[PDB]
Amino acid sequence: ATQEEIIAGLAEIIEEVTGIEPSEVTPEKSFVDDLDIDSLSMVEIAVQTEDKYGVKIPDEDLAGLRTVGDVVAYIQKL
Amino acid sequence: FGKLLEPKRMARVRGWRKVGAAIVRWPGPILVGAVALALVGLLTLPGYRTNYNDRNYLPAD
Amino acid sequence: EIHAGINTGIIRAMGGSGSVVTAAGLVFAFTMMSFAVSELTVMAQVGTTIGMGLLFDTLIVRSFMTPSIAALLGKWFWWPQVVRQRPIPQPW
């Protein structure tokens, strides 16, 4: 499915960025409550996604997404 | 020979990646802020006087 | 580190090398700044000038200004070479 492949690509990104294993990165938990993420780490995720897997997430919209399911849904709706 | 040079703790690389991404996302405002501090440094420069007397650069004993 | 995107190159080279250059600058700068307690005034002046200049160069120029200019000029930073802003977008 497209959803699981996008989750796999994002999980590879989050593995490279903040050192969190892909096994328990699931779309059923949030970023800042469970993975202990920062605001600037969202910028890291955004920039790495822009270069590696070309798709545009603008400014002032990283804060709109809170869970991994929200981010993968945001990617697949484009 | 032994177990001497090994990396302990991972906290500086993550922070410097964070400030690098901060630079990348907003290259406009960070440049104008940095050059603003640069101008604050530079406006003092044209008023500058030297002293060729070393008598005032030594103790008095 | 250009080939996998230009500005991911900036973040990756920053995390790889800014730490090392800032560590070297900070050690040398504080070693030069400890000269300020000398009773010889001119040596204290030279040490304080070099130390304060190296804090300014390390902390606000090389850490904030130069990567900002590199990220603002973009692919025109490497002229006459023909570099690409992003790689070909790989599939999922």
Side-chain angles (χ1 to χ4, degrees), chain C residues 30-46:
Chain C
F30 282 128
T31 299
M32 286 311 296
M33 199 95 80
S34 66
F35 264 82
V37 299
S38 179
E39 79 167 339
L40 269 72
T41 288
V42 59
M43 214 57 215
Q45 293 228 63
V46 175

PDB file of all heavy atoms in Angstrom, chain C residues 30-46:
ATOM      1  N   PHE C  30      39.508  30.665  24.391  1.00  0.00           N
ATOM      2  CA  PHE C  30      39.593  30.840  25.836  1.00  0.00           C
ATOM      3  C   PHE C  30      41.033  30.749  26.330  1.00  0.00           C
ATOM      4  O   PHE C  30      41.391  31.424  27.309  1.00  0.00           O
ATOM      5  CB  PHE C  30      38.695  29.827  26.535  1.00  0.00           C
ATOM      6  CG  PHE C  30      37.242  30.200  26.497  1.00  0.00           C
ATOM      7  CD1 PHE C  30      36.290  29.306  26.037  1.00  0.00           C
ATOM      8  CD2 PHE C  30      36.832  31.460  26.896  1.00  0.00           C
ATOM      9  CE1 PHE C  30      34.952  29.656  25.995  1.00  0.00           C
ATOM     10  CE2 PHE C  30      35.498  31.816  26.858  1.00  0.00           C
ATOM     11  CZ  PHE C  30      34.558  30.912  26.406  1.00  0.00           C
ATOM     12  N   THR C  31      41.876  29.958  25.652  1.00  0.00           N
ATOM     13  CA  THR C  31      43.305  29.970  25.953  1.00  0.00           C
ATOM     14  C   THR C  31      43.909  31.348  25.702  1.00  0.00           C
ATOM     15  O   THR C  31      44.727  31.831  26.495  1.00  0.00           O
ATOM     16  CB  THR C  31      44.022  28.905  25.120  1.00  0.00           C
ATOM     17  OG1 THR C  31      43.502  27.613  25.449  1.00  0.00           O
ATOM     18  CG2 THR C  31      45.519  28.919  25.381  1.00  0.00           C
ATOM     19  N   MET C  32      43.501  32.009  24.618  1.00  0.00           N
ATOM     20  CA  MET C  32      44.002  33.353  24.357  1.00  0.00           C
ATOM     21  C   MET C  32      43.376  34.391  25.285  1.00  0.00           C
ATOM     22  O   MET C  32      44.026  35.385  25.622  1.00  0.00           O
ATOM     23  CB  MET C  32      43.761  33.728  22.897  1.00  0.00           C
ATOM     24  CG  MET C  32      44.687  33.025  21.924  1.00  0.00           C
ATOM     25  SD  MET C  32      46.423  33.124  22.405  1.00  0.00           S
ATOM     26  CE  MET C  32      46.722  34.885  22.295  1.00  0.00           C
ATOM     27  N   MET C  33      42.126  34.187  25.705  1.00  0.00           N
ATOM     28  CA  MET C  33      41.461  35.141  26.585  1.00  0.00           C
ATOM     29  C   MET C  33      41.949  35.067  28.025  1.00  0.00           C
ATOM     30  O   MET C  33      41.819  36.052  28.759  1.00  0.00           O
ATOM     31  CB  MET C  33      39.943  34.940  26.548  1.00  0.00           C
ATOM     32  CG  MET C  33      39.155  36.145  27.049  1.00  0.00           C
ATOM     33  SD  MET C  33      38.606  37.273  25.767  1.00  0.00           S
ATOM     34  CE  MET C  33      37.178  36.397  25.163  1.00  0.00           C
ATOM     35  N   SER C  34      42.539  33.945  28.444  1.00  0.00           N
ATOM     36  CA  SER C  34      43.096  33.908  29.795  1.00  0.00           C
ATOM     37  C   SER C  34      44.352  34.758  29.953  1.00  0.00           C
ATOM     38  O   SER C  34      44.839  34.900  31.079  1.00  0.00           O
ATOM     39  CB  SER C  34      43.405  32.475  30.204  1.00  0.00           C
ATOM     40  OG  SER C  34      44.443  31.935  29.411  1.00  0.00           O
ATOM     41  N   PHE C  35      44.891  35.314  28.866  1.00  0.00           N
ATOM     42  CA  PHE C  35      46.024  36.228  28.933  1.00  0.00           C
ATOM     43  C   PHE C  35      45.666  37.586  29.524  1.00  0.00           C
ATOM     44  O   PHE C  35      46.574  38.381  29.787  1.00  0.00           O
ATOM     45  CB  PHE C  35      46.612  36.437  27.538  1.00  0.00           C
ATOM     46  CG  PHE C  35      47.790  35.562  27.237  1.00  0.00           C
ATOM     47  CD1 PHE C  35      47.609  34.253  26.825  1.00  0.00           C
ATOM     48  CD2 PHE C  35      49.079  36.055  27.351  1.00  0.00           C
ATOM     49  CE1 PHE C  35      48.692  33.448  26.541  1.00  0.00           C
ATOM     50  CE2 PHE C  35      50.166  35.254  27.072  1.00  0.00           C
ATOM     51  CZ  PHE C  35      49.974  33.949  26.665  1.00  0.00           C
ATOM     52  N   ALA C  36      44.376  37.872  29.732  1.00  0.00           N
ATOM     53  CA  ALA C  36      43.938  39.191  30.178  1.00  0.00           C
ATOM     54  C   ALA C  36      44.384  39.522  31.598  1.00  0.00           C
ATOM     55  O   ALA C  36      44.459  40.703  31.947  1.00  0.00           O
ATOM     56  CB  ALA C  36      42.416  39.296  30.082  1.00  0.00           C
ATOM     57  N   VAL C  37      44.683  38.513  32.423  1.00  0.00           N
ATOM     58  CA  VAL C  37      45.100  38.759  33.804  1.00  0.00           C
ATOM     59  C   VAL C  37      46.571  39.109  33.925  1.00  0.00           C
ATOM     60  O   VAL C  37      47.069  39.254  35.050  1.00  0.00           O
ATOM     61  CB  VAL C  37      44.806  37.539  34.699  1.00  0.00           C
ATOM     62  CG1 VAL C  37      43.314  37.251  34.726  1.00  0.00           C
ATOM     63  CG2 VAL C  37      45.588  36.326  34.220  1.00  0.00           C
ATOM     64  N   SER C  38      47.287  39.238  32.812  1.00  0.00           N
ATOM     65  CA  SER C  38      48.708  39.550  32.860  1.00  0.00           C
ATOM     66  C   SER C  38      48.939  40.985  33.314  1.00  0.00           C
ATOM     67  O   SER C  38      48.158  41.887  33.001  1.00  0.00           O
ATOM     68  CB  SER C  38      49.345  39.332  31.489  1.00  0.00           C
ATOM     69  OG  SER C  38      50.722  39.662  31.510  1.00  0.00           O
ATOM     70  N   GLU C  39      50.022  41.192  34.062  1.00  0.00           N
ATOM     71  CA  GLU C  39      50.398  42.534  34.481  1.00  0.00           C
ATOM     72  C   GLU C  39      51.047  43.334  33.360  1.00  0.00           C
ATOM     73  O   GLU C  39      51.118  44.564  33.457  1.00  0.00           O
ATOM     74  CB  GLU C  39      51.336  42.466  35.688  1.00  0.00           C
ATOM     75  CG  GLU C  39      52.777  42.148  35.344  1.00  0.00           C
ATOM     76  CD  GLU C  39      53.724  42.405  36.494  1.00  0.00           C
ATOM     77  OE1 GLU C  39      53.364  43.180  37.406  1.00  0.00           O
ATOM     78  OE2 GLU C  39      54.831  41.829  36.488  1.00  0.00           O
ATOM     79  N   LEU C  40      51.525  42.672  32.309  1.00  0.00           N
ATOM     80  CA  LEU C  40      51.971  43.372  31.112  1.00  0.00           C
ATOM     81  C   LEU C  40      50.749  43.691  30.265  1.00  0.00           C
ATOM     82  O   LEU C  40      50.021  42.781  29.852  1.00  0.00           O
ATOM     83  CB  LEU C  40      52.978  42.533  30.329  1.00  0.00           C
ATOM     84  CG  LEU C  40      54.460  42.731  30.660  1.00  0.00           C
ATOM     85  CD1 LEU C  40      54.822  42.136  32.011  1.00  0.00           C
ATOM     86  CD2 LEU C  40      55.328  42.140  29.565  1.00  0.00           C
ATOM     87  N   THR C  41      50.516  44.979  30.020  1.00  0.00           N
ATOM     88  CA  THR C  41      49.246  45.398  29.437  1.00  0.00           C
ATOM     89  C   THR C  41      49.157  45.020  27.962  1.00  0.00           C
ATOM     90  O   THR C  41      48.105  44.566  27.503  1.00  0.00           O
ATOM     91  CB  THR C  41      49.055  46.904  29.647  1.00  0.00           C
ATOM     92  OG1 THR C  41      48.771  47.152  31.027  1.00  0.00           O
ATOM     93  CG2 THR C  41      47.887  47.432  28.834  1.00  0.00           C
ATOM     94  N   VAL C  42      50.262  45.148  27.219  1.00  0.00           N
ATOM     95  CA  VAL C  42      50.224  44.943  25.770  1.00  0.00           C
ATOM     96  C   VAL C  42      49.948  43.480  25.421  1.00  0.00           C
ATOM     97  O   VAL C  42      49.200  43.187  24.477  1.00  0.00           O
ATOM     98  CB  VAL C  42      51.518  45.478  25.119  1.00  0.00           C
ATOM     99  CG1 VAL C  42      52.763  44.789  25.662  1.00  0.00           C
ATOM    100  CG2 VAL C  42      51.451  45.344  23.608  1.00  0.00           C
ATOM    101  N   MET C  43      50.512  42.540  26.189  1.00  0.00           N
ATOM    102  CA  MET C  43      50.231  41.127  25.951  1.00  0.00           C
ATOM    103  C   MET C  43      48.780  40.801  26.271  1.00  0.00           C
ATOM    104  O   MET C  43      48.144  40.008  25.565  1.00  0.00           O
ATOM    105  CB  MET C  43      51.174  40.256  26.776  1.00  0.00           C
ATOM    106  CG  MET C  43      51.567  38.964  26.083  1.00  0.00           C
ATOM    107  SD  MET C  43      52.336  39.262  24.478  1.00  0.00           S
ATOM    108  CE  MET C  43      51.721  37.869  23.537  1.00  0.00           C
ATOM    109  N   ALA C  44      48.237  41.423  27.320  1.00  0.00           N
ATOM    110  CA  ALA C  44      46.823  41.268  27.636  1.00  0.00           C
ATOM    111  C   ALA C  44      45.946  41.821  26.522  1.00  0.00           C
ATOM    112  O   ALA C  44      44.916  41.227  26.188  1.00  0.00           O
ATOM    113  CB  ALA C  44      46.503  41.958  28.960  1.00  0.00           C
ATOM    114  N   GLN C  45      46.345  42.950  25.930  1.00  0.00           N
ATOM    115  CA  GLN C  45      45.578  43.534  24.834  1.00  0.00           C
ATOM    116  C   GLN C  45      45.576  42.625  23.615  1.00  0.00           C
ATOM    117  O   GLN C  45      44.526  42.404  23.001  1.00  0.00           O
ATOM    118  CB  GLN C  45      46.138  44.905  24.460  1.00  0.00           C
ATOM    119  CG  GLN C  45      45.961  45.959  25.517  1.00  0.00           C
ATOM    120  CD  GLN C  45      45.409  47.239  24.952  1.00  0.00           C
ATOM    121  OE1 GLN C  45      44.297  47.267  24.438  1.00  0.00           O
ATOM    122  NE2 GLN C  45      46.190  48.301  25.021  1.00  0.00           N
ATOM    123  N   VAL C  46      46.746  42.087  23.254  1.00  0.00           N
ATOM    124  CA  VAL C  46      46.835  41.191  22.101  1.00  0.00           C
ATOM    125  C   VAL C  46      46.015  39.928  22.338  1.00  0.00           C
ATOM    126  O   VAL C  46      45.246  39.495  21.465  1.00  0.00           O
ATOM    127  CB  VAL C  46      48.307  40.865  21.785  1.00  0.00           C
ATOM    128  CG1 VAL C  46      48.400  39.847  20.668  1.00  0.00           C
ATOM    129  CG2 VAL C  46      49.057  42.123  21.398  1.00  0.00           C
TER     130      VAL C  46
END
